[PDB]
């Protein structure tokens, strides 16, 4: 349908700062990614599943070692066990 | 069309001289610009424009158009 022939051939920016700009969650409620009280961690996991820079997000999160929120489709203890493994 | 319009003679027919017309048009243009700038706020201050304008028209041109049309008055304080 309205796919623009996979981004088409009309582009003038020819400039990218980094993989932040390709983040899908930026098009989405930030609050849902930090479940307070008990919360849930599956809808935002589904959102991350379709992210095109999931690997980069996971790598950056692990390298900087944030212990809050859900990054790369994984929550805190998945990151912790991956770090410990 | 442009800086040429409206004709200067028609404007001068509505005032005393060029020197007063300059101040008159400039004051009206400042009023219009001030109205536009604070349009985001819900405010009752300044009024206009009183004519049909374009997407992005210089307030001075609108002021001159209203002056020519005869929709303004000048007093001495």
């Amino acid at each position: 349908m309205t796919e623009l022939f996979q981004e088409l051939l009309v582009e003038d920016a020819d400039e990218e700062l980094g993989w932040q700009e390709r983040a899908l969650c930026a098009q989405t409620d930030p609050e849902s990614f930090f479940p307070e009280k008990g919360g849930s961690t599956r809808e935002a996991k589904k959102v991350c599943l379709a992210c095109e820079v999931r690997s980069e997000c996971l790598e950056y999160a692990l390298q900087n070692d944030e212990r809050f929120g859900i990054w790369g489709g994984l929550s805190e203890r998945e990151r912790r066990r991956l770090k410990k493994k | 069309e442009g800086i040429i319009n409206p004709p200067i003679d028609e404007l001068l027919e509505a005032t005393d001289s060029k020197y007063s017309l300059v101040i008159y048009a400039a004051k009206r243009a400042r009023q219009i610009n001030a109205y536009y700038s604070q349009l985001g706020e819900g405010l009752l201050e300044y009024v206009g424009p009183l004519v049909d304008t374009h997407v992005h028209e210089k307030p001075l041109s609108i002021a001159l158009r209203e002056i020519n049309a005869g929709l303004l008055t000048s007093e001495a304080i």
Binding site: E3, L8, V10, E16, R22, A26, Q27, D29, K46, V47 | -
Partner: protein, 214 residues
């Protein structure tokens, strides 16, 4: 049922520029699309309301500086529902790139533009208003209105839920039969939400109807 509601919303005056931009982006994303034909991109937005199409065309012309056609021929073909379609062909690529549908010289953005999100509460409620104008319904089949508005893909629906949360108004995303929407069930949230969008007479009528029936 909803015709009066959408008429009242369309007739609401708007002043702030950012909220107008957000409303235009929302309506274009929900009830709009792009087509690459003859080597150029053309934007087509289909509305089923009288004043809404004119409002969208005026907003485009004013803030984004573009011209539209406002054809009345029904794409459905019935010609009874007055399926208005507003078209933008001249500078379609510029409008698409500068309104948030496409960014980064890449694929169309599934969710709402990032500019609309992380904005003031006024822009969030304007985006919700545009979403309701584009698509939605007010059923009141049984005990609750089910103020449901459908969205393309989970991303737009959950973004609308997030925007509603910033208004301190409860909302719930749902998916059924492969199509997903956002709904709010309890009457209090329905009334507060409809009040915030700007409708007044419809809000009253709904209030008395609910209080008398319930």
């Amino acid at each position: 049922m909803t015709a009066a509601v959408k008429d009242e919303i369309s007739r609401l005056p708007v002043t702030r520029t950012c909220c107008r931009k957000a409303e235009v982006s929302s309506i274009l994303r929900f009830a709009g699309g792009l087509h690459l034909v003859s080597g150029r991109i053309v934007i087509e937005a289909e509305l089923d309301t009288a004043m809404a199409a004119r409002r969208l065309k005026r907003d485009i012309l004013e803030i984004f500086g573009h011209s539209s056609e406002l054809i009345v021929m029904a794409p459905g073909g019935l010609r009874r529902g007055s399926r208005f379609v507003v078209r933008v062909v001249a500078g379609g690529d510029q409008l698409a790139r500068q309104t948030g549908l496409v960014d980064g010289r890449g694929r169309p953005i599934r969710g709402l533009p990032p500019q609309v999100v992380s904005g003031a509460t006024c822009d969030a409620e304007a985006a919700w208003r545009g979403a309701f104008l584009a698509h939605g319904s007010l059923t009141e089949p049984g005990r609750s209105s089910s103020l449901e508005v459908t969205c393309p893909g989970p991303e737009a629906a959950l973004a609308l839920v997030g925007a509603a949360r910033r208004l301190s108004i409860a909302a719930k995303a749902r998916e059924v039969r492969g199509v997903d929407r956002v709904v709010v069930r309890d009457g209090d949230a329905i009334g507060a939400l409809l009040t915030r969008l700007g409708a007044h007479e419809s809000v009253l009528a709904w209030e008395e109807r609910r209080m008398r029936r319930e």
